[PDB]
Scaffold this active site. Structure first.
Site, PDB file in Angstrom:
ATOM      1  N   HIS A 183      40.830  65.271  67.180  1.00  0.00           N
ATOM      2  CA  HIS A 183      40.276  65.589  68.516  1.00  0.00           C
ATOM      3  C   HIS A 183      41.386  65.912  69.479  1.00  0.00           C
ATOM      4  O   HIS A 183      42.455  65.304  69.461  1.00  0.00           O
ATOM      5  CB  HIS A 183      39.463  64.389  69.009  1.00  0.00           C
ATOM      6  N   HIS A 229      42.084  65.715  73.023  1.00  0.00           N
ATOM      7  CA  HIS A 229      41.485  64.897  74.067  1.00  0.00           C
ATOM      8  C   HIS A 229      41.579  65.506  75.447  1.00  0.00           C
ATOM      9  O   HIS A 229      42.704  65.728  75.954  1.00  0.00           O
ATOM     10  CB  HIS A 229      42.151  63.497  74.064  1.00  0.00           C
ATOM     11  N   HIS A 274      44.558  63.177  68.626  1.00  0.00           N
ATOM     12  CA  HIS A 274      44.497  61.981  67.817  1.00  0.00           C
ATOM     13  C   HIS A 274      43.470  62.130  66.719  1.00  0.00           C
ATOM     14  O   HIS A 274      42.475  62.845  66.891  1.00  0.00           O
ATOM     15  CB  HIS A 274      44.248  60.710  68.671  1.00  0.00           C
ATOM     16  N   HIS A 320      40.139  61.260  64.964  1.00  0.00           N
ATOM     17  CA  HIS A 320      38.841  60.824  65.463  1.00  0.00           C
ATOM     18  C   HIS A 320      37.924  60.489  64.281  1.00  0.00           C
ATOM     19  O   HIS A 320      36.711  60.775  64.317  1.00  0.00           O
ATOM     20  CB  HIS A 320      38.236  61.867  66.436  1.00  0.00           C
ATOM     21  N   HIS A 331      36.781  48.050  79.970  1.00  0.00           N
ATOM     22  CA  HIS A 331      36.525  49.129  79.029  1.00  0.00           C
ATOM     23  C   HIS A 331      36.806  50.486  79.643  1.00  0.00           C
ATOM     24  O   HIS A 331      36.178  50.842  80.648  1.00  0.00           O
ATOM     25  CB  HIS A 331      35.059  49.089  78.543  1.00  0.00           C
ATOM     26  N   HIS A 366      35.130  57.199  78.136  1.00  0.00           N
ATOM     27  CA  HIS A 366      35.588  58.596  78.027  1.00  0.00           C
ATOM     28  C   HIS A 366      34.419  59.465  77.611  1.00  0.00           C
ATOM     29  O   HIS A 366      33.633  59.109  76.725  1.00  0.00           O
ATOM     30  CB  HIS A 366      36.723  58.704  77.001  1.00  0.00           C
ATOM     31  N   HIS A 425      33.555  63.374  76.210  1.00  0.00           N
ATOM     32  CA  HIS A 425      34.026  64.627  75.642  1.00  0.00           C
ATOM     33  C   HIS A 425      33.392  65.803  76.389  1.00  0.00           C
ATOM     34  O   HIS A 425      32.359  65.677  77.041  1.00  0.00           O
ATOM     35  CB  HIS A 425      33.663  64.738  74.147  1.00  0.00           C
ATOM     36  N   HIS A 428      32.031  57.247  74.937  1.00  0.00           N
ATOM     37  CA  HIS A 428      32.360  55.976  74.264  1.00  0.00           C
ATOM     38  C   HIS A 428      33.494  55.279  74.984  1.00  0.00           C
ATOM     39  O   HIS A 428      34.275  55.878  75.719  1.00  0.00           O
ATOM     40  CB  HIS A 428      32.714  56.224  72.797  1.00  0.00           C
ATOM     41  N   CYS A 429      33.603  53.965  74.733  1.00  0.00           N
ATOM     42  CA  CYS A 429      34.794  53.218  75.111  1.00  0.00           C
ATOM     43  C   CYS A 429      35.968  53.732  74.267  1.00  0.00           C
ATOM     44  O   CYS A 429      35.846  53.914  73.052  1.00  0.00           O
ATOM     45  CB  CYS A 429      34.582  51.710  74.832  1.00  0.00           C
ATOM     46  N   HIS A 430      37.116  53.953  74.921  1.00  0.00           N
ATOM     47  CA  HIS A 430      38.289  54.440  74.204  1.00  0.00           C
ATOM     48  C   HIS A 430      39.198  53.336  73.677  1.00  0.00           C
ATOM     49  O   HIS A 430      40.319  53.615  73.190  1.00  0.00           O
ATOM     50  CB  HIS A 430      39.099  55.453  75.064  1.00  0.00           C
ATOM     51  N   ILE A 431      38.776  52.066  73.722  1.00  0.00           N
ATOM     52  CA  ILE A 431      39.393  51.027  72.877  1.00  0.00           C
ATOM     53  C   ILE A 431      38.806  51.275  71.472  1.00  0.00           C
ATOM     54  O   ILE A 431      37.584  51.145  71.245  1.00  0.00           O
ATOM     55  CB  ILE A 431      39.078  49.651  73.429  1.00  0.00           C
ATOM     56  N   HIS A 448      36.516  49.032  69.685  1.00  0.00           N
ATOM     57  CA  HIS A 448      35.180  48.952  70.269  1.00  0.00           C
ATOM     58  C   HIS A 448      34.292  50.088  69.835  1.00  0.00           C
ATOM     59  O   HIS A 448      33.113  49.901  69.582  1.00  0.00           O
ATOM     60  CB  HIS A 448      35.269  48.811  71.798  1.00  0.00           C
ATOM     61  N   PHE A 507      30.382  51.016  70.273  1.00  0.00           N
ATOM     62  CA  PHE A 507      30.248  51.188  71.754  1.00  0.00           C
ATOM     63  C   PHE A 507      30.285  52.696  72.127  1.00  0.00           C
ATOM     64  O   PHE A 507      31.265  53.198  72.727  1.00  0.00           O
ATOM     65  CB  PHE A 507      31.353  50.395  72.486  1.00  0.00           C
TER      66      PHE A 507
HETATM   67 CU   LIG Z   1      35.743  48.653  75.135  1.00  0.00          CU
HETATM   68 CU   LIG Z   2      40.432  60.574  72.989  1.00  0.00          CU
HETATM   69 CU   LIG Z   3      37.957  63.108  74.096  1.00  0.00          CU
HETATM   70 CU   LIG Z   4      36.449  60.508  71.588  1.00  0.00          CU
END
Ligand SMILES: [Cu+2]
Ligand SMILES: [Cu+2]
Ligand SMILES: [Cu+2]
Ligand SMILES: [Cu+2]
Ligand SMILES: *[C@@H]1O[C@H](CO)[C@@H](O[C@@H]2O[C@H](CO)[C@@H](O)[C@H](O)[C@H]2NC(C)=O)[C@H](O)[C@H]1NC(C)=O
Ligand SMILES: *[C@@H]1O[C@H](CO)[C@@H](O[C@@H]2O[C@H](CO)[C@@H](O)[C@H](O)[C@H]2NC(C)=O)[C@H](O)[C@H]1NC(C)=O
Ligand code: NA
Length: 499
Positions: free
Chosen positions: A65, A67, A110, A112, A397, A400, A402, A452-455, A458, A463
């Protein structure tokens, strides 16, 4: 050297020791972080990703992905596994061929697939602006002015229990740093500046989890960009940066020639700086080659506060100036229990057929889409509001979206919304108990967009939801190349999956 906008990128396994401890990794371009992919605004990027992975302990499939890049008309190139594509299998390659109209700033790339980016597949992605409105504020902006902040684990990701509080073993700044336990005096990164010059430092969180309190002893930092969006100048002495966020700041090399600590304190893992953990070195040309002797203050007098940020351009806010003042006002119920996260009562588990392929095959409402309850349709050409009230365990949290950036109408730790001039960005901390962080955007980009949460731990624990934006126009807006159509047959054959 930077690579791109047209380049090959090989994904390999190798041993690395960024904190003195050797472990195997998943790498782009043979390094951690991966090489910087760069071009100019509006360029055509064609990143032909060669999957050369062989170690099953970090997964031999992959997907990448880009980002923060909107992928308008190229949803198939976005990268999230089982949302926009099936993974690339080992021994195969795939050309991510897209354009970056109307965007210029600091981004990253990164893996994905699952938690694979934690195992090392992360690097910077910079889209320069030949007519940058901030160009006169600095002298130097190049690969030497990118600063990455990363969490690093001695345990391999696929051995991290799902839904657990997973803690790192080192903070790495530009790929180097020292371990929190069994600390060894392994090499620290050096960022070199010349007395009197001004630098555009591009600060990139490539974290899988922690947020960092980032500062430079003796120096302050003038923010000019937030997640790709040019800002008015805001001078601070500390930046709390959450996973996946980016800032550009001007560093004025205006202190005496010498060595100064660069500090990145994570919210979990090792606290402080003993033994040179959580540290790197700012060295002026002509300084002695030795460690800094500088001190942090006990408290920082001008920390970044997100409501202080404002766009350089007159971006405004879409919709009307009150809660629910949008065509499609949503409130997500964000929860955690028993090792799994949920959104609106549903924990995300990736489907067998990617969401985009389900839509191209004719499924045309969100209740026809899998996973059931994990896909929300958005209407076209409409103002969307999404309230993200915090309280779920494991915060704060960083959410993010897309395919989009968004106005941050309400930020963490402040109950007052801003319908006039809030910053726009792509990853936002939703804060703490009782907060009501809220985002707005307009739907002008047909396709399925992950939220989604980017941790990353998670996301793996569920999440996430998918916004199926303008389902009726997805197929006409996003013509797909044969190589993309080939991915799911190849993946399902390799894995003995019937679909
Ligand atoms: Cu999170
Ligand atoms: Cu990302
Ligand atoms: Cu992204
Ligand atoms: Cu993503
Ligand atoms: C966050 O703000 C949203 C609105 O953006 C609030 O949503 C309202 O929730 C109440 C019940 O809690 C409903 O009666 C309304 O239909 C919702 N929409 C409105 C008023 O526009 C939400 O309650 C807020 N959450 C927190 C924790 O403050
Ligand atoms: C809490 O957030 C609000 C809204 O973003 C901030 O209020 C703005 O404050 C600025 C700076 O003084 C004023 O120019 C704006 O008119 C305010 N807007 C609104 C809608 O009130 C506020 O400063 C933030 N609180 C803290 C402590 O930073
Ligand atoms: Na407006």
């Amino acid at each position: 050297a930077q690579i791109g906008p047209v380049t090959d990128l090989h994904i390999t396994n190798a041993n690395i020791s960024p904190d003195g401890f050797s472990r195997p990794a998943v790498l782009a371009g043979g390094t951690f972080p991966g090489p910087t992919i760069a071009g100019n605004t509006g360029d055509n990027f064609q990143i032909t990703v060669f999957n050369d992975l062989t170690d099953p302990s970090m997964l031999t499939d992959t997907s990448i992905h880009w980002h923060g890049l909107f992928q308008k008309g190229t949803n198939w190139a976005d990268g999230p596994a089982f949302v926009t594509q099936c993974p690339i299998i080992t021994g195969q390659s795939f050309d991510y061929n897209f354009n970056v109209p109307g965007q210029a700033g600091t981004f990253w790339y990164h893996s994905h697939l699952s938690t694979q980016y934690c195992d090392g597949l992360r690097g910077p992605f910079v889209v320069y602006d030949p007519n940058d409105p901030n160009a006169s504020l600095y002298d130097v902006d190049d690969d030497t002015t990118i600063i990455t902040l990363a969490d690093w684990y001695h345990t391999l990701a696929q051995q991290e229990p799902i839904g657990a509080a997973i803690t790192a073993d080192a903070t790495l700044i530009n790929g180097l740093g020292r371990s929190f336990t069994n600390t060894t005096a392994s090499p620290l990164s050096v960022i070199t500046v010349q007395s009197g010059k001004r630098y555009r430092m591009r600060l990139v969180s490539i974290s899988c989890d922690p947020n960092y309190l980032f500062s430079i002893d003796g120096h302050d930092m003038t923010i000019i960009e937030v997640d790709g969006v040019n800002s008015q100048q805001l001078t601070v002495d500390q930046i709390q940066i959450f996973a996946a966020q980016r800032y550009s700041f001007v560093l004025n090399a205006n202190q005496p020639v010498g060595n100064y600590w660069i500090r990145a304190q994570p919210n979990s893992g090792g606290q402080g700086f003993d033994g040179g953990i959580n540290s790197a070195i700012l060295r002026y040309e002509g300084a002695t080659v030795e460690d800094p002797t500088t001190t942090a203050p006990t408290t920082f007098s001008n920390p970044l506060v997100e409501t202080d940020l404002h766009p350089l351009a007159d971006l405004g806010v879409p919709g009307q100036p009150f809660r629910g003042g949008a065509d499609d006002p949503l409130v997500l119920n964000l929860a955690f229990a028993n090792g799994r996260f949920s959104i609106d009562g549903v924990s995300f588990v990736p489907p067998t057929v990617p969401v985009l392929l389900q839509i191209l095959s004719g499924a045309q409402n969100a209740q026809d889409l899998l996973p059931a309850g994990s896909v929300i349709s958005l209407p076209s050409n409409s103002v969307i509001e999404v309230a993200l009230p915090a309280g779920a365990a494991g915060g704060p949290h960083p959410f993010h979206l897309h395919g989009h950036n968004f106005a941050v109408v309400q930020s963490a730790n402040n109950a007052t919304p801003n319908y006039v001039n809030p910053i726009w960005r792509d990853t936002v901390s939703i804060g703490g108990t009782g907060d009501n962080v809220t985002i707005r955007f307009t739907t002008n980009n047909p396709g399925p967009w992950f939220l989604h949460c980017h941790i990353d731990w998670h996301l793996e624990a569920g999440f996430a939801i998918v916004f199926a934006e303008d389902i009726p126009d997805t197929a006409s807006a996003n013509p797909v190349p044969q190589a993309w159509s080939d991915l799911c047959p190849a993946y399902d054959q390799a894995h003995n999956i019937s679909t």
